[PDB]
Design a protein around this ligand. Structure first.
Ligand SMILES: Nc1nc2c(ncn2[C@@H]2O[C@H](COP(=O)(O)OP(=O)(O)O)[C@@H](O)[C@H]2O)c(=O)[nH]1
Ligand SMILES: [Mg+2]
Ligand SMILES: [Mg+2]
Ligand SMILES: [Mg+2]
Ligand SMILES: [Mg+2]
Ligand SMILES: [Mg+2]
Ligand SMILES: [Mg+2]
Ligand SMILES: [Mg+2]
Ligand SMILES: [Mg+2]
Ligand SMILES: [Mg+2]
Ligand SMILES: [Mg+2]
Ligand SMILES: [Mg+2]
Ligand SMILES: [Mg+2]
Ligand SMILES: [Mg+2]
Ligand SMILES: [Mg+2]
Ligand SMILES: [Mg+2]
Ligand SMILES: [Mg+2]
Ligand SMILES: [Mg+2]
Ligand SMILES: [Mg+2]
Ligand SMILES: [Mg+2]
Ligand SMILES: [Mg+2]
Ligand SMILES: [Mg+2]
Ligand SMILES: [Mg+2]
Ligand SMILES: [Mg+2]
Ligand SMILES: [Mg+2]
Ligand SMILES: [Mg+2]
Ligand SMILES: [Mg+2]
Ligand SMILES: [Mg+2]
Ligand SMILES: [Mg+2]
Lengths: 82, 62, 205, 703, 85
RNA sequence: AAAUUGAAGAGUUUGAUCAUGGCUCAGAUUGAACGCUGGCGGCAGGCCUAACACAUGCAAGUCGAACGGUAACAGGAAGAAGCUUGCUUCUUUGCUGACGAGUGGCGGACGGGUGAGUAAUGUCUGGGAAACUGCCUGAUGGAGGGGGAUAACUACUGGAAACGGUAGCUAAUACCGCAUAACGUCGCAAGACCAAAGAGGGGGACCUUCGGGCCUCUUGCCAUCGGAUGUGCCCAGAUGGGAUUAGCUAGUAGGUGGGGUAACGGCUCACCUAGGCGACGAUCCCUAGCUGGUCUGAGAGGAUGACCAGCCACACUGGAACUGAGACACGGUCCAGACUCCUACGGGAGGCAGCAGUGGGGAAUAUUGCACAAUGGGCGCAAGCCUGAUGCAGCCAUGCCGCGUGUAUGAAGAAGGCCUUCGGGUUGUAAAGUACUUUCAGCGGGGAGGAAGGGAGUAAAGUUAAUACCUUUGCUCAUUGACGUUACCCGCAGAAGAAGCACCGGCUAACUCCGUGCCAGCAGCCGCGGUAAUACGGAGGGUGCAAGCGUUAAUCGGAAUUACUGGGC
C-alpha cells in the first residue's frame, strides 16, 4: 500500500498540500518516497491552484501505488475530461 | 555562597528565602552574586524613584 | 510604535529641518531652531564619530517617522539587495506608503499621511491598503478613496503641497487625487545632504 | 433520560447533637436500601460517611457527606424514591457544614438521643433549620439505652426548642427491651428481627401492654391532622374517623408549612426503627416539586425576579453549596441543581463573580466515592470538577437567571491561634495550604498580621483548628506548631506638657547647614480623635522659611507612626513647634528631621509616658443560670464589666478585656456554659493595664 | 487489560497450544530420522525421511515453519542419508 | 540572467611611552527566567531540572457482504387488550432492517511520547550479498470431496469482584487428513512431497424439499514467479574527553563438522589450531542518542542537536518467550523486584517517557478544551465507526512581524517645575484653545474560502444471454465546517479606551541643581563618595529603545587570546 496522498504543509488556516507517494504506515508529514506535484485549495486567483506530475504518478500506479480520493479528484480536474 | 544586598535598607533575616542572580561587588573580595530585590519576600528599596526596575520597586502613582 | 511627542525638539536636536511641520509659518518662527531642546542647549559639545553617525541615523529615522527595529530591517533588506546599501535603504524608505502619500500631497506632514493611510482613506493600485510601511512598487496607482475627498485637511494639504519641489518620479494627478509611482527615486532625486554611508557604517559597526 | 421522576426525590439532612446517631442512622439507611453490604459501626471506624482519616480515628463526623439511596418501603409499597441524604456534623465547632447543607436541603431528620433528648447542638441545628424555613421530622434514636424516654424527649422538643411535636411512632417495651414501634396511623406494631441485622420485621397487633396510650396519642394525631383544613375539620367534628390517606396528606401539608414536626423513634445501632423512619421521610417530607418555586433577584429586583419551577423545561440554575479539597484536581464543588438541566462539558455563568465556568466532569457522590454522570436535572445534588473560582453559596446558571439568593451569611470564627511551621523552609507551602483550606471553608480564615511576621488562623473552635492543623499535616503534608497571637499596643501621655528641645551640632564650621527645634507635646484625651497624631502650629521665635511652616507635622508623623516605646505606636499626642533656630537661606528638611528625631526622643525621655494595652469590648449572650460563672471567669481574667441586661431567652453581659489575655476564650465559655453561649468582639478604645511583658519585649534587646 | 486485546491474548494462547503440538510432532519425527541416521540403518532412516517430508512440507505451507526451514531440514537430512553409505 | 558585495575597534599596568599579556566593553542569538510596565492582531514556541510518583477522563477499533444467533430498537405476519370488525399498539415469530455478547478476519509492530540506555551492539556517507516482506500491483494456473470439533447458547454450580468449573450440543472465510498440484521444495538424476474458502447482488429459461439448484457479475480463497514498499544482514571511512587508564581477550581469533536463522556468520555446540586486538590509543573511567540542520563567523572555525524531518534506543526495573509477514510488543503474556489501589480477607487489578491534568523538584514552561469539517491511519464492497494522529480553540509579551495610542494649527512663548549672572533661559507648540480623521479596540449588519466528496434519481455505453445487478463517465436534486458571533466588508460615536523602561564621568548618545559627606550607597572595566559629587539619592532637562525596556544565565564574535587559514619561545 504505497499511497499517493496530500501532506498538508503550509500555515495556520492556509493549508497547502504536497502530493507525495508515501508508504502508508509513515505519518502524513513524515517519510515519503518522492513528491509529485502540489495543491493549494485556497488559491483563488490567476495563479495555478494545483500541479501534478502525471507521468510519475502513472509510473507509480503501474508499480501498484494506491491513490487517495483527493489525489484522484485532483487528477480528474487536472485532466480536461473533468 | 555569599551575595550582596543592593540598595538602601532591607529586611533580610537569618532564614528569609531570597532570589540570587549573578554579578559581583568587586570590592568585597568573595561576593560574586547579587540578591534580586522585590523577589521572594525581599521587599524593594523604599522611596526609590530612579533605576526603579532594579531594586524591585513598583511605579508610584505620581 | 509611533513617536507621539513634540516634533520641533527633534528638528532642532537634528539641527536642520526634518519637514515635521506644515508650511503655515516658518520653522524659526515656530521654535528656536538654532539651539537644542534642553536647558543646556546653548552649549555645543564636541561630537564624536559615533555621535555624528547616530545623529545622521536619527535624522533619517525622524524624517521618515520610523523606529529602530523597522529601520534595521530596512538596512538588512538594503544590504541584501544588490547595489549601494545606502541608495537601496533610501529607496526602501521612499517606497513606504505614507512617504509616497506625503511626497504626492494628500497630507502636510508624514504623520498626517500616516493617519490618511491607516484610516482606510488611501487606495493603492485598486486595493485599499492601511499599512503605513506598505512598500509601493514601480507603476502603482496610489489614490484617495471616496467619502474622504474635498474635506478640509485633504484640500488644504493638496494646496499646500505646492510651493515645494515636485518629485520627478510620481506624476501626480492633484485634481483627481491619485498619483503614479513609475520608478524608484534615484540618489539625485533626494535631499543629498543626508550621508547614507554614515548610516551604512553605523549599522556595520 | 430522567432515571427517577421529579416527585420521587427527597433531599434530606440528618442533623443533631454530637453522637446523637446521625452516622449510625445513615449506615442503617444505606444497608436497608442495599447500597452498603455491611452495617459497620462508627466507633470501629467502619462507617462509610466517616471516610476522612480524622473521622475514622476519632469517631466523629467533621464534614458534611452527601450520598444517595433508593427506597421503596418496608412492604415495597412505593416505586423507588431517591433520597439524597446528607450526614452533617453536629459539632458546634463545625456549624458552617450544617448551615451550608441545610440551605440547599428540602427536609431535615433531626435526631434526638432518647436519654438526653434536646441538647445544645440540637438547639443550634434547630435554629439553623428554622431560619432556612425547612420542613422537619424527628428521629428519637438511642431507644436501647437505659434512661431512654421517648415521651419525655418529645416534651423536651415541645418545651425547649419551641416546637409542637406530633408523636407518630410510639415505642413498645422498656429501654433494653426495645421490641419495636407502633405506628399511630396504621395501628400496626413493627417488630424487627434480631437474628439478622434488622433487615426483616413482623407486623403485630399492638398487644394489651399498651393500647390506651397508643389510642390516646392516635386520637391526638388525628385531631392534629384535622387542624389543617376546614374540609378535614368539618368531617372530624361530624364524627367519622379520617381515612389514613387524607390524614397523611393533611399532616404533609402541616410538615411543608412547618406547623408541626412528626416525631418517630428507633435504635439505629440495635437495627430498629430506621425503615419506619424512611417511610416517614417518603410519606411526610417534601420533594423538589412539592414546594412553591424558589426565588432570587434580577437587575435590582422586580415584581417577581425569579420563580423557578422544579422542572427541566427551564434554563439551568443551581447553587454550589460545598467546596472540597482534591489533591489531584484541586477542587470539587457539590452543587444542588434547583431548576433545569446541565451536562458534562457545558458552560455556565456564576452570577456572583459574573464569569464563565465549564463543567469538566459531573459526578454523583457516595461518601468519598464518585461516579461519573452525563447530566444533572433539577432537584438533584451532584459534584462538579473543573470549577476553579466558585465559592460556597455561588449561583451557577444559564444567562438571564437569578443573581443573589439567600446564602450570603456565615458565622464568625471565635478561636484564634498563630501557626508556625516546625521547619522555616516551609512558610510558602504552609501558606498555600492554609489559603486553599480557607477557600474551601468560609468560616475559617487565615491572615498574616502585619504588625509581626506571624500568621493568624481563625476558626469556629479548638476542635476545628486542630482538625485543620492535623489534616494539613496529613494531606499536602506540612508540619505545624500552634502558639499565641502577638499583641499590638499603643501609648499615650499621662498629662505631661513641657517646652522640650532638640539640637544637634551639625555645623562644625564647614558642614554648611544645621538647625534647632523646640517643641511641646500634650495628650488631648483618651480617644477623642480618629487621627492619633495631632499638631497645633506655634512656631514664632525664629519662624522657619515659609515653604514648609505647616509641613513640619507630616515629617513628625513618622515618630508617632511607630516605636517611641518598644516599637509600638501612640495615640492622643499633639505636637507644637514653638521655637527654634536656623539660617534663612537653605532650611534642609532632611537635616531638620534629625533635630525632630532628637526632640522627640528627649521629649519621651522627659515624659516617662506609659503604655496602653489593647482592650476590646466583648458582648456575650449566655443563659440565665451560668451568668455568675461567666462573669466570675471574666473577673478572674483582668477584665471589667459594663452593662446589665436580661434577654427573654438569656442574659447579655458586656465586658472589657485585654488581647494578650482571652486566648481561647470560646472553649472556656463553652465549658462553663455547656457550649450554649456566644460572644462577639468589637475592639473598643484602649485602657491602661499593668503588664510586665511591655518592658520585657524591649529589654530583651538590651538598650 | 483495558481494551479488548484480551481477545488476542486468548487467540495467542490457543495458537500457542496448537502450534506447540504440531511443532513438537514435527520435531519428534525429525528426531526419529536423526536417530535412524545415528543407528546407520539406511532403510529405516530413509523411511523416516519419507514420512517426515510430508509433515514438514505441510506445516511450512500452513505457516508454522518457513519454506526455507523445511528445505533446510530436507537438504540436511538427505545429505546425512547420502553420506550414511 | 541571480544565487551573493566581504574582515572596524575601544577602556584598563606607566609620571609618561612602546611592546607583551590578561580582564572588560560595543554585535548577533535564546525553548530563557527575574524587575517595572503593558493596547490589539498574524505566525511560531512553550518542564532545558525528578526516565521522579501518578488520581481521573479519553489516546484502537472495525467487519452481519464469514458464522451460530436475537440482548436493546424498528419493521412486517398471527391473534378473545385498546377496541366505533383495531388509528386507540397484550403476546409470539430472526422473517427483514439492524445488532450487545460470542467464534472468526484484519488491525493492534502504524500513528503518539521520551532520550534513561548507548561512544560504537548506534548514527552519517558510500557500497555489497546469504535474505524475507501482511496490505498494494502484473502473469499464469487451481478452487473434487470429507471429517471431528468448539465458542456462544442450554442445565447445574463456584466466586464480593476478577473471573471461572461439570456435562449437553449447535456454525463457519476456525481446525484436520485425503483427492490434485507444477516453470514450486528436496535430489545430480530417478523420482518423493506440499493448498485452498467461501460470500454478496440481480436473473428470462429449466428443475424445487418456497432451502434453492442452475446462468451470470463482483469480491474473497490457494500455488509459483515478478515488481514496488518495508525490514534484516555485512564492509570502508567519519562520528567526544582522559595515559593522573598500556596492555586486553579464552567462544576469545580462525578451521572442520552438527544444529539454528527468513537469511551469511562463534549465532550455537564438539573438537583442532594459538591465535586476534593495541602506541594510527586496545582495555579501563567519565560523558553522550546520531544526523539534515540551528546560532555565530568574511571565511576557516567554534558551540550546539529546542521546533521540523530521517535513523536508532526505550516503555515502572530485570529476564524470557508466545502470536504474527513483521515484536521479543507504551496502552499484550509470563515470571522476579519495589510501588499503588479494590477486597465481603478468601482473592483481584495497574504501570501517563500517548492527550490533558495533579504532587514534587526548579529561576522557569500551558487546558483535566471543541471536532473528526481538511488531510492521513485502521476496518469495511461501501455506507459508516474509531482516531488526544491531525485541524482548531484557550493560557503565557516567550520570540519574530505589523499596526495603534491621534493629525494640522496654536506665543498670552500662559501657569507650575527647574536653572539663573536675577536680565533671562528652559520644560515648549509642549499644554490649553481651534479645526480635522476615526485605523485599532467597543457596539450593529452583511459575508467568502478552507468542500473535495458522499447519498438518491436518470443517460450512455461496458458486462452478460438478460435495455436486470455491478462497476467507469455526464446530467441534475437536497446536502456535509469544529474553527465561527471566521477572514473580509459596511454603519454609530467621540480624540475617546491604549507609554513605558533604561541611561546621561570615559569607553558610550545624553548635564545642571539640591541633600548626604570614604557614611548612605554605585559599579560591565577603569573607578566614584572624606564639604560646591554631571559617577550615590531626589528633582528638572536630555539621550536610546519602545509595548516593550532593563537585569541575570548561555553560545559565538570581537579574541590573530590554541594562530590550519593565522601567533610565539
Ligand atoms: N447503644 C446505642 N449506640 C448508638 C446508637 N446510635 C449510635 N450509637 C453509637 O454511638 C456513637 C455515636 O453515634 P454515631 O452514629 O457515630 O453518631 P454521630 O456522631 O452523631 O453522627 C457510636 O459509637 C455509635 O455506634 C443507638 O441507638 N444505641
Ligand atoms: Mg513591534
Ligand atoms: Mg457520627
Ligand atoms: Mg465519641
Ligand atoms: Mg548446516
Ligand atoms: Mg510515572
Ligand atoms: Mg474520544
Ligand atoms: Mg455484534
Ligand atoms: Mg459439528
Ligand atoms: Mg484456513
Ligand atoms: Mg583511549
Ligand atoms: Mg544520557
Ligand atoms: Mg574571525
Ligand atoms: Mg522535549
Ligand atoms: Mg514468536
Ligand atoms: Mg503494543
Ligand atoms: Mg500507557
Ligand atoms: Mg516550586
Ligand atoms: Mg478519512
Ligand atoms: Mg516660568
Ligand atoms: Mg473594528
Ligand atoms: Mg461545494
Ligand atoms: Mg463554504
Ligand atoms: Mg559623550
Ligand atoms: Mg546608577
Ligand atoms: Mg553589564
Ligand atoms: Mg552637593
Ligand atoms: Mg578565534
Ligand atoms: Mg604571542
Amino acid at each position: 500500500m504505497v499511497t499517493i496522498r496530500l501532506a498538508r504543509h503550509g500555515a495556520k488556516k492556509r493549508p497547502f498540500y504536497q502530493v507525495v507517494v508515501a508508504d502508508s504506515r509513515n505519518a502524513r508529514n513524515g517519510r515519503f518516497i518522492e513528491r509529485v506535484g502540489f495543491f493549494n485549495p485556497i488559491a483563488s486567483e490567476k495563479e495555478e491552484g494545483t500541479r501534478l506530475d502525471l507521468d510519475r504518478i502513472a509510473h507509480w500506479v503501474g508499480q501498484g501505488a494506491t491513490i487517495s480520493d483527493r489525489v484522484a479528484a485532483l487528477i480528474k480536474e487536472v485532466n480536461k475530461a473533468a | 555562597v555569599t551575595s550582596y544586598i543592593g540598595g538602601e535598607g532591607h529586611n533580610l533575616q537569618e532564614h528569609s528565602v531570597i532570589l540570587i542572580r549573578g554579578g559581583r561587588v568587586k570590592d568585597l573580595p568573595g561576593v560574586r552574586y547579587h540578591t534580586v530585590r522585590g523577589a521572594l519576600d525581599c521587599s524593594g528599596v523604599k522611596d526609590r524613584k530612579q533605576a526603579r526596575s532594579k531594586y524591585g520597586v513598583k511605579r508610584p502613582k505620581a | 510604535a509611533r513617536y507621539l511627542g513634540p516634533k520641533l525638539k527633534l528638528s532642532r536636536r537634528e539641527g536642520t529641518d526634518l519637514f515635521l511641520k506644515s508650511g503655515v509659518r516658518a520653522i524659526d518662527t515656530k521654535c528656536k531652531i538654532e539651539q537644542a531642546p534642553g536647558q543646556h542647549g546653548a552649549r555645543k559639545p564636541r561630537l564624536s564619530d559615533y555621535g555624528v553617525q547616530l545623529r545622521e541615523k536619527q535624522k533619517v529615522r525622524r524624517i521618515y517617522g520610523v523606529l529602530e527595529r523597522q529601520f534595521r530591517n530596512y538596512y538588512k533588506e538594503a544590504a541584501r539587495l544588490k547595489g549601494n546599501t545606502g541608495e537601496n535603504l533610501l529607496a526602501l524608505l521612499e517606497g513606504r506608503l505614507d512617504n509616497v502619500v506625503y511626497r504626492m500631497g494628500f497630507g502636510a506632514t508624514r504623520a498626517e499621511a500616516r493617519q490618511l493611510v491607516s484610516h482606510k482613506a488611501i487606495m493603492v493600485n485598486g486595493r485599499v491598503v492601511n499599512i503605513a510601511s506598505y512598500q509601493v512598487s514601480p507603476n502603482d496607482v496610489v489614490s484617495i478613496r471616496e467619502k474622504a475627498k474635498k474635506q478640509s485637511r485633504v484640500k488644504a494639504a493638496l494646496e499646500l503641497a505646492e510651493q515645494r519641489e515636485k518629485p520627478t518620479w510620481l506624476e501626480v494627478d492633484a485634481g483627481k487625487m491619485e498619483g503614479t509611482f513609475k520608478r524608484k527615486p534615484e540618489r539625485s532625486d533626494l535631499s543629498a545632504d543626508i550621508n547614507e554611508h554614515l548610516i551604512v557604517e553605523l549599522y556595520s559597526k | 433520560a430522567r432515571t427517577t421522576p421529579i416527585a420521587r426525590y427527597r433531599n434530606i439532612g440528618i442533623s443533631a447533637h454530637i453522637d446523637a446517631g446521625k452516622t449510625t442512622t445513615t449506615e442503617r439507611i444505606l444497608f436497608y436500601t442495599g447500597v452498603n453490604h455491611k452495617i459497620g459501626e462508627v466507633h470501629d471506624g467502619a462507617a462509610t460517611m466517616d471516610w476522612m482519616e480524622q473521622e475514622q480515628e476519632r469517631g466523629i463526623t467533621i464534614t458534611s457527606a452527601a450520598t444517595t439511596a433508593f427506597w421503596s418501603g418496608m412492604a415495597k409499597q412505593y416505586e423507588p424514591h431517591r433520597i439524597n441524604i446528607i450526614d452533617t456534623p453536629g459539632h458546634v465547632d463545625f456549624t458552617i457544614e450544617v448551615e451550608r447543607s441545610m440551605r440547599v436541603l428540602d427536609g431535615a431528620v433531626m435526631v434526638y438521643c432518647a436519654v438526653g433528648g434536646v441538647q445544645p447542638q440540637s438547639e443550634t441545628v434547630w435554629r439553623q433549620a428554622n431560619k432556612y424555613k425547612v420542613p422537619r421530622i424527628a428521629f428519637v434514636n438511642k431507644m436501647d439505652r437505659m434512661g431512654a424516654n421517648f415521651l419525655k424527649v418529645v416534651n423536651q422538643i415541645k418545651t425547649r426548642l419551641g416546637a409542637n411535636p406530633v408523636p407518630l411512632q410510639l415505642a413498645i417495651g422498656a429501654e433494653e427491651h426495645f421490641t419495636g414501634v407502633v405506628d399511630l396511623v396504621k395501628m400496626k406494631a413493627i417488630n424487627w428481627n434480631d437474628a439478622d441485622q434488622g433487615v426483616t420485621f413482623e407486623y403485630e397487633d399492638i398487644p394489651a401492654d399498651m393500647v390506651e396510650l397508643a389510642n390516646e396519642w392516635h386520637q391526638n394525631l388525628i385531631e392534629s391532622a384535622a387542624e389543617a383544613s376546614e374540609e378535614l375539620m368539618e368531617k372530624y367534628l361530624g364524627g367519622e374517623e379520617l381515612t389514613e390517606a387524607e390524614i397523611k396528606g393533611a399532616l404533609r401539608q402541616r410538615v411543608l408549612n412547618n406547623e408541626i414536626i412528626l416525631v418517630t423513634c428507633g435504635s439505629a445501632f440495635k437495627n430498629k426503627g430506621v425503615q419506619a423512619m424512611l417511610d416517614a421521610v417518603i410519606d411526610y417530607l417534601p420533594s423538589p416539586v412539592d414546594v412553591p418555586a424558589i426565588n432570587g433577584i434580577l437587575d435590582d429586583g422586580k415584581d417577581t425576579p425569579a420563580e423557578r419551577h422544579a422542572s427541566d423545561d427551564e434554563p439551568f440554575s443551581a447553587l454550589a453549596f460545598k467546596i472540597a479539597t482534591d489533591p489531584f484536581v484541586g477542587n470539587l464543588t457539590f452543587f444542588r441543581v434547583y431548576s433545569g438541566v446541565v451536562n458534562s462539558g457545558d458552560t455556565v455563568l456564576n452570577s456572583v463573580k459574573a464569569a464563565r465556568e465549564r463543567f469538566g466532569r459531573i459526578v454523583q457522590m457516595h461518601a468519598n466515592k464518585r461516579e461519573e454522570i452525563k447530566e444533572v436535572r433539577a432537584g438533584d445534588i451532584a459534584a462538579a470538577i473543573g470549577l476553579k473560582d466558585v465559592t460556597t453559596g455561588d449561583t451557577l446558571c444559564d444567562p438571564d437567571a437569578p443573581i443573589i439568593l439567600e446564602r450570603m451569611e456565615f458565622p464568625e470564627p471565635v478561636i484564634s491561634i498563630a501557626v508556625e511551621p516546625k521547619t522555616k523552609a516551609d512558610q510558602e507551602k504552609m501558606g498555600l495550604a492554609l489559603g486553599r483550606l480557607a477557600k474551601e471553608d468560609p468560616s475559617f480564615r487565615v491572615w498574616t498580621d502585619e504588625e509581626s511576621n506571624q500568621t493568624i488562623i481563625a476558626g469556629m473552635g479548638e476542635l476545628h483548628l486542630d482538625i485543620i492543623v492535623d489534616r494539613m499535616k496529613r494531606e499536602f503534608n506540612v508540619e505545624a506548631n500552634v502558639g499565641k497571637p502577638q499583641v499590638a499596643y499603643r501609648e499615650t501621655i499621662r498629662q505631661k506638657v513641657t517646652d522640650v528641645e532638640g539640637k544637634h551640632a551639625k555645623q562644625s564650621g564647614g558642614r554648611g547647614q544645621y538647625g534647632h527645634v523646640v517643641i511641646d507635646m500634650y495628650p488631648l484625651e483618651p480617644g477623642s480623635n480618629p487621627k492619633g497624631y495631632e499638631f497645633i502650629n506655634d512656631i514664632k521665635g525664629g519662624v522657619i522659611p515659609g515653604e514648609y511652616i505647616p509641613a513640619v507635622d507630616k515629617g513628625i508623623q513618622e515618630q508617632l507612626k511607630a516605636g517611641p516605646l518598644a516599637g509600638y505606636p501612640v495615640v492622643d499626642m499633639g505636637i507644637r513647634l514653638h521655637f527654634g533656630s536656623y539660617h534663612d537661606v537653605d532650611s534642609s528638611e532632611l537635616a531638620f528631621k534629625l533635630a525632630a528625631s532628637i526632640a522627640f526622643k528627649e521629649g519621651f525621655k522627659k515624659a516617662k509616658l506609659v503604655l496602653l494595652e489593647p482592650i476590646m469590648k466583648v458582648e456575650v449572650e449566655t443563659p440565665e443560670e451560668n451568668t455568675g460563672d461567666v462573669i466570675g471567669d471574666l473577673s478572674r481574667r483582668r477584665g471589667m464589666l459594663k452593662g446589665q441586661e436580661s434577654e427573654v431567652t438569656g442574659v447579655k453581659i458586656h465586658a472589657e478585656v485585654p488581647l494578650s489575655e482571652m486566648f481561647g476564650y470560646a472553649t472556656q465559655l463553652r465549658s462553663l456554659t455547656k457550649g450554649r453561649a456566644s460572644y462577639t468582639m468589637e475592639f473598643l478604645k484602649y485602657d491602661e493595664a499593668p503588664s510586665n511583658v511591655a518592658q520585657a519585649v524591649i529589654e530583651a534587646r538590651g538598650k | 487489560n483495558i481494551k479488548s486485546a484480551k481477545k488476542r491474548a486468548i487467540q495467542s494462547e490457543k495458537a500457542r497450544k496448537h502450534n506447540a503440538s504440531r511443532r513438537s510432532m514435527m520435531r519428534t519425527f525429525i528426531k526419529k530420522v536423526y536417530a535412524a541416521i545415528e543407528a546407520g540403518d539406511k532403510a529405516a532412516a530413509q523411511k523416516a525421511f519419507n514420512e517426515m517430508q510430508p509433515i514438514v512440507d505441510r506445516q511450512a505451507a500452513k505457516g508454522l515453519i518457513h519454506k526455507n526451514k523445511a528445505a533446510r531440514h530436507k537438504a540436511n537430512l538427505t545429505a546425512q542419508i547420502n553420506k550414511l553409505a
